[PDB]
Amino acid sequence: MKTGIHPEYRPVVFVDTSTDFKFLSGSTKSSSETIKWEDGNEYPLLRVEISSDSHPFYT
């Protein structure tokens, strides 16, 4: 993996407002927000539009 070419690969937690569950998945755009789960390994947080697990059709 080259350096000083691509944007950050840093991990970040994604959370849905409805179901309210947390999971780790690395992506761009951190935004820098605190989390509850895994308090030791601090990661950013992003607000997410309604997920699949919440919606009963896809579930």
Task: Give residues in contact with another protein (CB under 8 A).
Answer: 1, 5-7, 9, 14, 16, 23-29, 46, 48-55, 57-58
Find the part of the chain contacting RNA (CB under 7 A) among 1-9, 22-30, 40-48, 49-57.
Answer: 1-9
Q: DSSP letters of 25-41?
A: ---S-------SSSSSS
Tokens, residue 22: 């947390």
Residues 5-34 vs RNA: string with x where CB under 7 A?
xx----------------------------
Q: How far apart are CA 2 and CA 27, in angstroms?
A: 17
